[PDB]
Amino acid sequence: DSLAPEDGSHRPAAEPTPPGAQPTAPGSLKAPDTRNEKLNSLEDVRKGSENYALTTNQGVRIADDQNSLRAGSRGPTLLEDFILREKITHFDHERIPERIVHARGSAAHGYFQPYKSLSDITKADFLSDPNKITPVFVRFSTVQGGAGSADTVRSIRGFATKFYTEEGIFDLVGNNTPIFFIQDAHKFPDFVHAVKPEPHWAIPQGQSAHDTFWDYVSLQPETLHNVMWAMSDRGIPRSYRTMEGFGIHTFRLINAEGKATFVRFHWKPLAGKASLVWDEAQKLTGRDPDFHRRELWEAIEAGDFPEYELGFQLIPEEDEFKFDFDLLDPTKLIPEELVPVQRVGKMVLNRNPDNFFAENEQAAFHPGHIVPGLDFTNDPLLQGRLFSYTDTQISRLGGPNFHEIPINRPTCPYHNFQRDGMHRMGIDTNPANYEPNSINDNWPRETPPGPKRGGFESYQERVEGNKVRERSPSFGEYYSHPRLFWLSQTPFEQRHIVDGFSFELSKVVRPYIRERVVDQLAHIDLTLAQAVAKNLGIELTDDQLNITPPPDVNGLKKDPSLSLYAIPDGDVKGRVVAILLNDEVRSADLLAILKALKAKGVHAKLLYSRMGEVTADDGTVLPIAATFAGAPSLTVDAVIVPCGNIADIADNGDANYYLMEAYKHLKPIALAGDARKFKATIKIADQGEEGIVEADSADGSFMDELLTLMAAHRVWSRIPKIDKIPA
Amino acid sequence: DSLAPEDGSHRPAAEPTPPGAQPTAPGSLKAPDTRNEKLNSLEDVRKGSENYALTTNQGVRIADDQNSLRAGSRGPTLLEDFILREKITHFDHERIPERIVHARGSAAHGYFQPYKSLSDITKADFLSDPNKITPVFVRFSTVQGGAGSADTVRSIRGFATKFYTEEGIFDLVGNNTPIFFIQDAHKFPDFVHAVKPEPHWAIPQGQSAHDTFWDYVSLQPETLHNVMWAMSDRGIPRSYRTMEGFGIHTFRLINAEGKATFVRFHWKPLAGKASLVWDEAQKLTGRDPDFHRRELWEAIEAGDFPEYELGFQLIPEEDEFKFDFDLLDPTKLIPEELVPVQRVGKMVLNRNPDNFFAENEQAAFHPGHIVPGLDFTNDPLLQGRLFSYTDTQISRLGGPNFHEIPINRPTCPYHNFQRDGMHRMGIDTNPANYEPNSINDNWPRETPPGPKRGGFESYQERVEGNKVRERSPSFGEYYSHPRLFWLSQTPFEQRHIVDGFSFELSKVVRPYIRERVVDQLAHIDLTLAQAVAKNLGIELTDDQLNITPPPDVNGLKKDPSLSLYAIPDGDVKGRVVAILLNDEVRSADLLAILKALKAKGVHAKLLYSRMGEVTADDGTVLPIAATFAGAPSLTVDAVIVPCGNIADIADNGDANYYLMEAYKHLKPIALAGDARKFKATIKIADQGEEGIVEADSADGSFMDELLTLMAAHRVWSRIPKIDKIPA
Numbered sequence A, B: 001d002s003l004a005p006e007d008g009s010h011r012p013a014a015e016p017t018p019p020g021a022q023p024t025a026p027g028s029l030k031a032p033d034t035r036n037e038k039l040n041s042l043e044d045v046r047k048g049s050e051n052y053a054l055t056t057n058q059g060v061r062i063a064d065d066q067n068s069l070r071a072g073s074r075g076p077t078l079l080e081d082f083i084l085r086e087k088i089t090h091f092d093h094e095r096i097p098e099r100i101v102h103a104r105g106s107a108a109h110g111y112f113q114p115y116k117s118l119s120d121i122t123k124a125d126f127l128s129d130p131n132k133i134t135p136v137f138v139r140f141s142t143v144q145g146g147a148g149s150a151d152t153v154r155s156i157r158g159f160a161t162k163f164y165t166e167e168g169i170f171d172l173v174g175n176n177t178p179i180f181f182i183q184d185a186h187k188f189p190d191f192v193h194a195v196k197p198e199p200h201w202a203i204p205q206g207q208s209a210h211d212t213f214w215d216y217v218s219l220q221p222e223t224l225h226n227v228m229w230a231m232s233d234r235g236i237p238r239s240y241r242t243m244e245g246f247g248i249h250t251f252r253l254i255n256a257e258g259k260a261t262f263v264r265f266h267w268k269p270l271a272g273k274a275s276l277v278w279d280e281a282q283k284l285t286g287r288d289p290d291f292h293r294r295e296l297w298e299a300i301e302a303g304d305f306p307e308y309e310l311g312f313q314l315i316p317e318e319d320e321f322k323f324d325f326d327l328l329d330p331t332k333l334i335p336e337e338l339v340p341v342q343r344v345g346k347m348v349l350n351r352n353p354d355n356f357f358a359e360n361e362q363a364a365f366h367p368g369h370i371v372p373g374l375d376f377t378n379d380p381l382l383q384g385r386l387f388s389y390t391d392t393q394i395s396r397l398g399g400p401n402f403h404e405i406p407i408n409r410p411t412c413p414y415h416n417f418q419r420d421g422m423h424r425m426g427i428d429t430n431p432a433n434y435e436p437n438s439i440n441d442n443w444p445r446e447t448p449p450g451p452k453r454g455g456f457e458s459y460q461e462r463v464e465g466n467k468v469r470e471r472s473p474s475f476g477e478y479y480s481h482p483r484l485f486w487l488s489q490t491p492f493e494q495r496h497i498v499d500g501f502s503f504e505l506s507k508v509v510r511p512y513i514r515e516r517v518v519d520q521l522a523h524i525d526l527t528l529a530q531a532v533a534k535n536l537g538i539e540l541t542d543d544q545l546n547i548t549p550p551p552d553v554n555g556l557k558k559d560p561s562l563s564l565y566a567i568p569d570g571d572v573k574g575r576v577v578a579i580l581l582n583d584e585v586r587s588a589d590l591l592a593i594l595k596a597l598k599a600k601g602v603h604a605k606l607l608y609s610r611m612g613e614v615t616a617d618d619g620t621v622l623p624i625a626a627t628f629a630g631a632p633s634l635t636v637d638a639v640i641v642p643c644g645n646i647a648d649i650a651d652n653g654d655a656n657y658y659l660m661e662a663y664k665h666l667k668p669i670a671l672a673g674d675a676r677k678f679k680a681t682i683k684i685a686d687q688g689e690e691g692i693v694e695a696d697s698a699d700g701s702f703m704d705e706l707l708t709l710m711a712a713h714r715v716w717s718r719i720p721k722i723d724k725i726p727a
């Protein structure tokens, strides 16, 4: 019975459509022609559905899937009902342990390709040829919250990429800020317990704004650098497409001659950098907790494929000790003003998964998964990471055969003498399960290291020292990097940093914790320290006002690449506008609006005070995407109000509020014809104001003004005007 | 090191304190003297900390917990560092699968006591004497969301009680609505999959507002009854303390004479019934995803112990077929106007756990866990539940010995011949591990059924019919209960239901699903259906307008017990008021305000534009709990603005917004003296309006008027006035 509508509107068209135009769907159904070698190898396990009989897991067709088997229709359920018991058993056992950290994350498939061969600095096969494509799977995530926590919380973001290379899987497991909070892996559990929900009551979810986090931070000043990044707008990116990615650690590149070059990995978002503002981001955790997940998935369904440029910071082995910070300390960044990022390749994510659980939830990334041509360093954080990912995956994924879970399998050959383990898929036919063996003529065999297709050999780094549990003295500097970061931010970015700390610390119950954090800020920058103190009603002592600021980092008083916005990099393709309709829309305005949006690849969402349709003045029937309250201004990049019967919406509280919120959150607003009467709601200017586009009608000029504002992301100059507004 | 403040302010006092006054803490440190038998029996596994050396799990003291062992202070981490490896290993394996459903929950310890012996109707030992105290552990929960999802989502709530009786554990696993969505347990995986995040992209979290839910509901009209309850304000309770609880299924009570009586279990909230309004709930999911968890914990830390009355709907075996609905159908309620709830006992929750993971996360509740004196019925949803809880716990809790996890252990004796299994704690000394045996003289032995302390014997219900997979034809009625519920609601409740369906259907992307649900609403009630259809821009057809309304339920055209608010039952103790300060508060107003709240057990939170202190007009120093933006109006029940230097906050956007939000969400507001300048902000006439308390000062009847308003929970008369207002 219960079947599809006659018109076939239950099923999404298999072509790129704008967000909200069609029901989203499994990637292989939405984009059947989008392929890559990894995507294709997953076909052995894909399972369709159309035209097949419903069955048990043993293949027995089910006749009645609505009822348990009972002795009489009002009788007891019988134990012999094996259909019911398999069905309920499988349901009872759906859940697997979520990731210890980064449990909340969203992933997609794609491909990578280098711009040119890097064979002079590395023998890694995936970086050796500009026309040799490597399939990728990328998972972006938050850090602290559970798998069901919200996307747009304040947090560091993970950015993990699995490269299915010809010589093995390479996972580049990084974050959206260039440093981590702590120096040695031994303190990981300590840092993570402090930022996670407090042990007695398991509060708060997905947030650092609570006593144990600020306690830990105040007692461990090595965390201040990453805490500055987290409190800036870097902790609340607008989308996974508009954030940077970094491997943080110094790794090594090894070429065919055996030369080692120190390397730091970067991803540059080709959609530019952009973040939300705090109030918007926190409200968005309530209006749409899956905002980033949704936005990623929709951009891929729309053809706005997230694109990132892989880049390398390269430091010759002889310059190991030439900075004023240790290269092996993960709480220290390498300023691009000192070591520029060399462009290496492009990564495009062009296909969503079919099943979230099977591919996203069971994906396993590990910074230890390297290939010939790459090698580690002694960074003490990285070092302990090599132990942990392998270990956690044995319980998370139920045993040691997690490499056999479809998303995790290499697409290149894998042969060895490992056998058995829970849920073993691979049936080995080798007569031998050990080497050396003569009965299989010693196959599979070891392969010497060499220029290409060779066996892995570690770089022979010289090791000299006593066995000690000791932090390197060169790691003992905690304030100059925080200060460099502060000084490179724009004034409005600095304010947002002050506000992040003031908000967070105001949720710290124990007041001495607040004071101690303020004291640490005083070691970074007195202006910052005083601005946070003032918000906390704290007064800096005379001693605190005399703390000398830390030294510059190798002569640097600022580095503009550390700011999200000092260097313009705005891109409107893939952004979205809210269009507030009225019941007699002036079609001429809409037409002009939609044409200019379409030329720049900007999407639109048609909003009204009810769902269904409204008819424009020329008879055009406009389907309503959502209501004013149901898809808040939080979810769009700018707002446009066309003319028409404005009296229909002029007194609407949600419509008025829509604009006050957009205004407060510094988004571009454009008002045509009688829509300019809404200017009194956002109680400001009569001759106009930068950030508000206005005209008798929506024209070419009106739309260029709006699109230019959109390209600068937000109206920073409006900051001074928003704190009187009641929104 | 000795890191605590010398003042001792890192430590909350071990005495009842109001919410926000001190840092919250593990139950046994916060209320050491609050004991019960179960709480005392857990003392064997409680672990302290103070004054102990830091060790490995094997008892080896640790010297340096800040660093890994390496070959040189900048060298590689050594494999021999067993301290690092045990520490990271335990951390790496901290997580366990979350519950398949009801993963998000909050729990507490308490005790139960019956009002009088129920021996005439049940031989259940915990109900046989009013001086017999049974320890309980209760967990309240949402349904769909992960363990990290938000508290205040729209959803049914779970209400599970573990009774540690002298004759066994009895778990009463119910919800906050008297019926469930589906009739037979075979469809649980289908219903649950439909309500959970859609499989391709795992969106949306914690919400039924999406296509698959509404698709399922529109094809399975048996769900409408519970969908009505979920769409009403029942789905967004103000707190776990202000909601009702139900067992849902008909069970049996068996007395010593062998007589079976049918029973439905109810829990009445002694704090009264209270819910939020949708906008507030939704916004609260972002501002504080742990609002319910927090309120429960702080209520118990303040002495506002959540209290519930256990009540029984009793129906003689002879009346099984006397109703319009089948008693064994879980989608049907038993109208209290037909069968009154008989008061049975009182449950008081008076202590939080010590460790959320250990006690809450690992608690295992199961409706099949009954004791002599109770028995099941053939309700087909219940019948399948009896299989599921046992099964799911083998994987969630790691094996068949989950009854040995401290929180789950019986306080009464348990002895049998079961052995081994993962994580086996009990070391059995019985020479025999089988019965009958002669080698231990057959111990432990079976015990015949009897009036007290006898063995379990099922009631000998007659069974008759063929082995069939068949829904009873008596279950095929889907619309009269939904209609009864609808007609029992106040007019503002009906509107809220209409708004729930409207908002939810507005997030369904496929319009035909919205149409199909509207067609189903039209079989319940025309006014409901038309109002929802209008909100969706849908017109009912002439046939839909002529669908005949379903019959009354046994002559009833309404039952006021089904409404949250038709019959006042307001209780103010434990509610919280926001006090908006200024920098020279009339201290006379504040003294009047604070004393009056305290007299009724009403808590207060002093708010301002910054943290720190402000000084009242007489020099009283006032400590600030949070900012206007930091503890939004969503988290209080009422707002009071005292006189002083109102010009200080008159133009504060946040202060103004605070009132707008509280006014929009129907909360009582009280403005003293010059605080009445805020009337313009919320458009209050000069003459005033019901719901707004205003006077020249906070003396006389000012606090009595505000407290009368708090007792009625919200100002429903204000609904029409909020329609407009931009907030």
Ligand code: HEM
Pocket (backbone or CB within 6 Å): A098, A099, A100, A101, A102, A105, A139, A140, A141, A157, A158, A159, A160, A173, A174, A175, A179, A180, A184, A185, A188, A247, A248, A249, A330, A363, A364, A365, A381, A382, A384, A385, A388, A389, A392, A393, A396, B088, B092
């Ligand atoms: C620079 C420092 C670090 C970065 C950039 C980082 C990044 C990440 C990312 C992006 C993920 C999620 C991968 C996914 O999407 O599945 C992750 C997970 C994880 N991280 Fe790291 N992390 C860092 C430090 C550490 C440390 C020091 C440890 C422990 C010694 C650690 C242990 C883990 C574990 C156990 C997981 C879960 C892996 C799984 O369950 O498969 N992380 N980390």
Ligand code: HEM
Pocket (backbone or CB within 6 Å): A088, A092, B098, B099, B100, B101, B102, B105, B139, B140, B141, B157, B158, B159, B160, B173, B174, B175, B179, B180, B184, B185, B188, B247, B248, B249, B330, B363, B364, B365, B381, B382, B384, B385, B388, B389, B392, B393, B396
């Ligand atoms: C009258 C209908 C139902 C009610 C009132 C109900 C209530 C609940 C509650 C309150 C919980 C959470 C317990 C806790 O806090 O740990 C729960 C969990 C659960 N429910 Fe039920 N449920 C119902 C129907 C069902 C059905 C039909 C099934 C499957 C046949 C089912 C399977 C489960 C499972 C597997 C869990 C997780 C338990 C665990 O992991 O320990 N429920 N249910």
